[PDB]
Symmetry: D2
Amino acid sequence: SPLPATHDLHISGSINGHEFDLEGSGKGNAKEGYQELHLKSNKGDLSFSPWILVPNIFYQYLPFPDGAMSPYQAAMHDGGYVMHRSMQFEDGAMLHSDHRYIYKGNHIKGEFRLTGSGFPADGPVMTNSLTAADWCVDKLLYPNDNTIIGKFDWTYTTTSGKRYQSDVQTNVTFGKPIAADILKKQPMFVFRKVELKHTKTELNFKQWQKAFQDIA
Amino acid sequence: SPLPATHDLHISGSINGHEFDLEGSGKGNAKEGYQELHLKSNKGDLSFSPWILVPNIFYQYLPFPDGAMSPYQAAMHDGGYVMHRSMQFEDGAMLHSDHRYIYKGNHIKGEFRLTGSGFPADGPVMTNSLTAADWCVDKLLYPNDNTIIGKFDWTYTTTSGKRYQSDVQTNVTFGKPIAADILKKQPMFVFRKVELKHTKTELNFKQWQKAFQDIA
Amino acid sequence: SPLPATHDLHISGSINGHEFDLEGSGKGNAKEGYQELHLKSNKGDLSFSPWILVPNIFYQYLPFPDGAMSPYQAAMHDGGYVMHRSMQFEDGAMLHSDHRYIYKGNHIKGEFRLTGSGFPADGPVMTNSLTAADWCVDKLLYPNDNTIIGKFDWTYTTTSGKRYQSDVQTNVTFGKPIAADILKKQPMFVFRKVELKHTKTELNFKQWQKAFQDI
Amino acid sequence: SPLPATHDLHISGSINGHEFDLEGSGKGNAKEGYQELHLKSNKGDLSFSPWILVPNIFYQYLPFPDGAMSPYQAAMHDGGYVMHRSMQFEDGAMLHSDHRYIYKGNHIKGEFRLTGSGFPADGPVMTNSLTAADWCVDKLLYPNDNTIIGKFDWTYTTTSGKRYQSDVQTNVTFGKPIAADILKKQPMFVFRKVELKHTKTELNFKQWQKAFQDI
């Protein structure tokens, strides 16, 4: 049926052993790749940079080239999917997440669970020193008919001027096979840009996305 | 108070998108480093090798050298701890886990949650071809007073004769500071051996452990 | 200070302990990114897939966007640069290289040294089962004014249908500071395509390259 | 077929694009694992911490347990071996090396080539702030009869108190098959300790080593 138009998210888990829990709703344009989302904390002030919740804070808004359904869009009413992502940061920290969804017509409800640990007390996550995430190219491959293995190098700029880097791998597992015509076009890349306004208790996130097999 | 003598575990999560859930109980000797555990499935036959649940299936049974309390033993009645472990396998699979505990006198109850994804359909986890885990040396460092960052190279032998390898990092976060005299002895290593008997629904696990700063 | 038009390569080292040595020459168009190269073995038949020598077989041919010189082209007559590249393969093999260059007007001479090891005897490098390399996006960052640290995920298709993957990092070190206006545009990405035809003793290589900051 | 008693090393390459070259000699006891080595620079003051040249500054000095020859000692008069080592540092730097040897009776001559790059100008290698290397356990596996693939996590202490970490993999490739009875004992671990005293031009290095399968 339809592409999604609106979504909500409950995201919870712990960073360095401290529990956090946020929820909120947003919307987007699934032909353009754009979405935005507001979150508010249920457990008081975040003790860590809200920027570490990106990329984790909805590829059902991502089309494939020339208006084709991405595998995420096609699965939405046919079998669904989950994601499992790993971020391994340069200073020894790690952050994993599980991503699950429920659809009600053109509305997506996400339930994401995250565990992040090992962030140094004086590093840029626990001092709120991340300032922006660099624009990013995601590389996707499909090693079998129901799995995407994707990877990107993820870097934030920070207040000291040094970037903060992590290796990010995302495995996406589908309830039914991906269409043969999607499977034959590998690798697929996706260019993304994000913005985030935030306080200690609230986030306003925006993201643009565009898949490509080749450039102009 | 006492070192632990008995424990139980509920461990659940998903592998390649399929949910699993096991529970059972065991016991050990916290002066010798030895424990054993029985698990039985609540959700029918496992669709994956039970060996992939090791190392995940209790360092409160591990003493430090010369009968000293390990940081895990000392935290047990003073602040507690959690663990976050990552296994990144050579064929692109990933498995993360969160480890939490509740103590009632000398009894430990564990509640572990795992997400593993990306195991190839013909690889050794999804074909039940893992045969044993190699003996292993864990290296621990304490980058601050409440955190252990530990690492080991984890390898199983398999029915084809080829080993199956992963990089394993475990971040352990303590509710109160680790004692100064433990913090000053780094790195600490731990030698471990495990055995596992299993069926599609039940596991019988055993593990021996011995911490060392140097060898004979 | 001309852009390069032609280039030679001597590339030697070992794979799994077996010494190899190739040389040959090629040409390209430094306004368009394209280059091509022929190589011939000086030590008999190669005992491994010639495809493993890609990406290692000249970013002086890469312009930056809108007719700008890339940092590689600008260094060419002003301090030079070297590269150090690491390939870490999914099956435990590793391949490192050192890249150095000498320029004579618009001609480049490359001298590259490689050590690869730990390729399984039944894997696709030692069985010559690599069939092509996937198109690739390289992400570059400049952590200081004389260094590029670049990364890509590098995958071959193989005769079995199973891809063969490696993490690739390339650190490029310049003899003089990169221009401030290049340093401000980060990350920079580069999209590349390669072809290779080969025999046991010869390689005929082609590459297209194009830098982009956005799509 | 004597065990080694004495050794020389010529080690050269570059760190962050700056060429370096050292040579010197040492000795050790191949029944006990210990060796020591002196090196002196042929190109002026080192511009980086000499500690970064450890572990790279001779497992022919390592016996295996119970007076057994290690695979390195047995290859010494029977086909030899080379090593390829990769150090991947937590701050993005990389250091690879190629190790080759020539034997004359009980003397070893090493010729090692290294390329390190991407060390931050304010990090502890380029500020000479590494103070010691932590004691270390090396895990070895033999995926086929002529290869060792070994791994350790390598950490220095520094003057700031913050350790400096790297993933280290060493692939060793033999000219003849390793003995079946060595191949059956896997993993094998090796516990090592090092010391280094240094100046801008000289290094005085000591190492203790002991193989173990169990404790």
